[PDB]
């Protein structure tokens, strides 16, 4: 049975993030509305200690974050250098919110290490852009990195797969010099698009050369092509790297209807990627991430919880607290937008062939 990281206090904390208000409550409430919590093991998240956070993040950064958090000082002169600002405002309590999420992802990882489950879920995690000494991209603390480091206590090789719209740069950079963690990110890569890194030529550094895989994708990609790409890369990665555990970031900012309006995916296409990873039958840590159409993010992660459970869910959205957010259709399915796929078969083939060549080196 999957572990579901959840408490009422946790969700309420996660609801207060500035760029996704109420999202955690919408997600949890939809999953509950589908009765899926009755098929999972609910685990209260432990808050991350300063020591656990400092295995990745600098004390100076954490100390500054905790400082501005006390009263929500969004005007502190040092904040710019620590990445706090427009994307990452210093909201009152943000240190507590970020320690809670870090703690939730560590807890999930610990359940995995203890053999409590094969699948552990923290839909409020996946804040993949944070650097050791810098907030970035709505991320204040890199819970993914913290979860990966925790898994490294037991599991010899960790694969991180990042299906968020944006390049998982914080996680890649944290592990760019090691061969013990392989990072794989599929993302939009176009000059001017955040965070501006992760071209197919970025493969990591030193001993970690070839242990970073980047798949730059253009606007308008749909389920079928995305899965073809993902399966092709993951097939090769799996043979080459032989992971003992997986951390999977499933940001829903790829899904049609997202205000970012870049990719054109549905939850079913992402679910095929998820299904492919789950059949490896490795310890798997599931994270959320982006997702700025709040109802669609809940539709996505609810459907994906369903595929983790091997259930097909009713197409009718059940009555619940946020029912009205699901109009005008009130169904779980998401229809792709009618706009061009900007991905040319030839460019995709060059990218995949380049990646295949890089992975030949991974011994």
């Amino acid at each position: 049975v999957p572990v579901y990281i959840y408490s009422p206090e946790y969700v309420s904390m996660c609801d207060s993030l500035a760029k996704i208000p109420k999202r955690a409550s919408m997600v949890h409430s939809l999953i509950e509305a589908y009765a899926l919590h009755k098929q999972m093991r609910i685990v209260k998240p432990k808050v991350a200690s300063m020591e656990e956070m400092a295995t990745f993040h600098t004390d100076a950064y954490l100390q500054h974050l905790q400082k501005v958090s006390q009263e929500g000082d969004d005007d502190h002169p040092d904040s710019i250098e620590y990445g706090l600002g427009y994307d990452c405002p210093a909201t009152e309590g943000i240190f507590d919110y970020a320690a809670a999420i870090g703690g939730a992802t560590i807890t999930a990882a610990q359940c995995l290490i203890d053999g409590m489950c094969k699948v552990a879920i923290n839909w409020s995690g996946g804040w993949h852009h944070a650097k050791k000494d810098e907030a970035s991209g709505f991320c204040y603390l890199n819970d993914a990195v913290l979860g990966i480091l925790r898994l490294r206590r037991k599991f010899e090789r960790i694969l991180y797969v990042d299906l968020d719209l944006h390049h998982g740069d914080g996680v890649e950079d944290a592990f760019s010099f090691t061969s013990k963690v392989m990072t794989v990110s599929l993302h939009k890569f176009s000059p001017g698009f955040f965070p501006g890194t992760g071209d197919v030529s970025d493969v990591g550094l030193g001993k970690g050369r070839y242990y970073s895989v980047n798949v730059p994708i253009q606007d308008g990609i749909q389920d079928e092509k995305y899965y073809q790409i993902c399966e092709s890369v993951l097939k090769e990665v799996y043979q080459a790297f032989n992971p003992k555990a997986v951390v999977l970031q499933l940001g829903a900012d790829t899904i049609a209807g997202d205000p970012m309006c870049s990719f054109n995916m549905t939850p079913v296409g992402i679910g095929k990627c998820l299904k492919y990873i789950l059949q490896w039958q490795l310890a798997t840590l599931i994270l959320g991430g982006g997702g700025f159409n709040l109802a669609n993010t809940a539709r996505c992660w609810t459907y994906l919880t369903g595929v983790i459970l091997g259930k097909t869910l009713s197409s009718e959205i059940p009555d619940h607290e946020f029912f009205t957010a699901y109009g005008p259709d009130y169904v779980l399915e998401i229809t792709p937008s009618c706009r061009p796929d900007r991905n040319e078969p030839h460019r995709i083939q060059q990218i995949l062939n380049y990646i295949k060549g890089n992975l030949k080196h991974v011994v």
Partner: peptide
Amino acid sequence: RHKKX
């Protein structure tokens, strides 16, 4: 540095 957002 880029904006996100």
